[PDB]
Design an enzyme around this catalytic site. Structure first.
Site, PDB file in Angstrom:
ATOM      1  N   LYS B  54       0.790  -1.240   0.000  1.00 25.96           N
ATOM      2  CA  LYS B  54       0.000   0.000   0.000  1.00 25.96           C
ATOM      3  C   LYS B  54       0.824   1.293   0.000  1.00 25.96           C
ATOM      4  O   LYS B  54       0.294   2.354  -0.324  1.00 25.96           O
ATOM      5  CB  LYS B  54      -1.020   0.003   1.143  1.00 25.96           C
ATOM      6  CG  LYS B  54      -2.215  -0.921   0.899  1.00 25.96           C
ATOM      7  CD  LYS B  54      -3.260  -0.754   1.984  1.00 25.96           C
ATOM      8  CE  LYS B  54      -4.585  -1.397   1.596  1.00 25.96           C
ATOM      9  NZ  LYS B  54      -4.524  -2.875   1.658  1.00 25.96           N
ATOM     10  N   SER B  82      -7.405   2.862   9.033  1.00 21.72           N
ATOM     11  CA  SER B  82      -6.271   2.448   9.845  1.00 21.72           C
ATOM     12  C   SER B  82      -5.898   1.019   9.445  1.00 21.72           C
ATOM     13  O   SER B  82      -6.580   0.401   8.624  1.00 21.72           O
ATOM     14  CB  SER B  82      -6.581   2.566  11.342  1.00 21.72           C
ATOM     15  OG  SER B  82      -7.532   1.606  11.765  1.00 21.72           O
TER      16      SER B  82
END
Ligand SMILES: *Cc1c(COP(=O)(O)O)cnc(C)c1O
Ligand SMILES: *Cc1c(COP(=O)(O)O)cnc(C)c1O
Ligand SMILES: [Mn+2]
Ligand SMILES: [Mn+2]
EC number: 5.1.1.18
Lengths: 322, 321
Positions: B54, B82
């Site tokens: 990511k 998160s």
């Protein structure tokens, strides 16, 4: 200055095993570098065939026997082992096409015995009574006319292990120190002979559990001082004491031994798991624990580039500490 | 035929992020090859900075959308996400000398709040109202003059993710298929665009938990169909449904979706741990699970060289199955 192996033995071992072992990578971690205050280089023997570095020594001690024809080749090999040595010897036997037998009681884990005949060695069950296993193994040798192979520090095993240093030197030529876990001392001794021959300014440090500190005590006392009693430690790969074959080399060519507590081994192993994503066994965490220990701060800042040998990845997942 | 990203976006993403992300290795396992009956290639994004792929999308999102003067750079970044996205975004923000804010539900676990602070992000609290969340977000966005960076629907994020496939094609020149875990579909969409541009004969397969099978259901029904209820799965990284920006690409450019049970995910993850010594999170085991599944046996024997994306290694070591 006489040792059981020479640099030449290590180079020959290299030629003998290169086609059958992985030339394992060196991996780095920026975050581990900042925790240690050093440039760390992890030699990834956890990726080695069988899950540990052992195959190196074991294959050199099995392949380096055939004189040419099928006359001086072992008819069979027999062992008790079960652990990393067992996996190594058995795989080495499969590669050479040597019938292999393992004598085990009902004490070894499922995963370990599945990975012990994971190389096609016949499993013979002796009743869990210690001296009961000796009679069955003697019976196997009688029928096969083969050889018993116990955990060893014979010259060929030390030389096979030294090949780790040959690769490290090509992979990290600017290495200032190698940090090696120490059990029977074969790995650190082979590395020491190799490193000190090629680049004598490079340091060789042994890393040892304080719960199994025979190597530390030996260097301190100046004589071979084996463990009083079978040590208790999570670093199960370094339970055996150093021996007659590795002591002289450790005495003269290993710069220092760094002891580490059980908590330090656990933290260090978890650190590798979490930041490097490498599934090392706790024994392979000993090296990082040594680098992070209070005592290692005495080591010069000039000793910046440090190679830690991640010696194995054969973790028993059915058991946990944290 | 026309999507929210193009191939050119992916190439620009590569130029954008290449000096700051790892070109992660491809590893192999002969014993895994024998179990699967195919040649497997494991792209090791678990070795990527922050522990997952990511970082690619997160960093491209910062470096990409820029009014090209000294006066025109994002001054902060914000996300509701998160976990792997939050960690990647914060890391990328630090690289760029910029603050990162995570909108956190006030009832979130104590350990997760601490972990967010630990990796250097400012926590901003909200109610789990899914209306006060974006209210708090847009409030921070205006305060900080920052940008919202979505985990999977953002064009720049999808484009960044596609750079995985650029490396795979160079690293496995004879690759026949890529097998990619699917959550929001950012990764698989980016990879699909890249693969179908450079070598369209290569298959792209999405791998999904049947407990979170919205991508499978969407492909089957021919329309975007989100999970009806929050998914119950060990693959925590792929709980998100695919969205408006990822669906069209998946619809046209993803060849198939393979579903896998919870036991299949668990077993394949354990297989990677034990055989390869790679500490992948269960979400990353989803791809191997797909390859080993009964339905994958229908895949042509010509499809021999398979690249599985080991998407992440951020596993919580306080809980074992
Ligand atoms: C066998 C072993 C060691 C120790 O090596 P010695 O040569 O015996 O000192 C270290 N780590 C692991 C994982 C081992 O298996
Ligand atoms: C987020 C994530 C995924 C899913 O990616 P999408 O782009 O949401 O499909 C897969 N694996 C890991 C480790 C992730 O963090
Ligand atoms: Mn010892
Ligand atoms: Mn899904």
């Amino acid at each position: 200055a006489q040792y059981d192996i020479s640099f030449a033995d290590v180079e020959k071992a290299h030629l003998n095993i290169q086609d059958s072992v992985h030339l394992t990578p060196v991996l780095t971690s920026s975050i581990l570098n900042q925790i240690a205050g050093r440039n760390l280089f992890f030699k990834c023997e956890l990726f080695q065939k069988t899950g540990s570095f052992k195959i190196r020594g074991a294959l050199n001690a099995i392949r380096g026997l055939i004189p040419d024809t099928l006359e001086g080749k072992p008819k069979a090999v027999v062992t008790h082992s079960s652990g990393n040595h067992g996996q190594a010897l058995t795989y080495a036997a499969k590669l050479e096409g040597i019938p292999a037998y393992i004598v085990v009681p009902q004490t070894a884990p499922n995963c370990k015995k599945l990975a012990i005949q994971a190389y096609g060695a016949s499993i013979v069950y002796s009743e869990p009574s210690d001296e009961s296993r000796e009679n069955v193994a003697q019976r196997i040798i009688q029928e096969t006319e083969g050889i018993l192979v116990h955990p060893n520090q014979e010259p060929a095993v030390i030389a096979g292990q030294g090949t780790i240093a040959l690769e490290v030197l090509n992979q990290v030529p600017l290495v200032d120190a190698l940090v090696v876990p120490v059990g029977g001392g074969g790995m650190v001794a082979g590395i020491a002979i190799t490193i000190k021959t090629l680049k004598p300014s490079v340091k060789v440090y042994a890393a040892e559990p304080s719960n199994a500190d025979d190597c530390y005590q030996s260097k301190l006392k100046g004589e071979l001082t084996p463990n009083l009693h079978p040590p208790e430690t999570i670093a199960d790969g370094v339970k055996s004491s150093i021996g007659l074959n590795t002591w002289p080399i450790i005495r003269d060519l290993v710069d220092d031994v760094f002891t580490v507590t059980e908590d330090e081994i656990k933290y260090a192993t978890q650190l590798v798991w979490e930041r490097m994503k490498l599934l090392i066994e706790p024994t392979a965490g000993v090296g990082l624990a040594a680098v992070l220990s209070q005592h290692f701060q005495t080591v010069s800042p000039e000793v910046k580039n440090i190679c830690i040998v991640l010696s194995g990845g054969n973790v028993d997942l059915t058991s946990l500490s944290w």
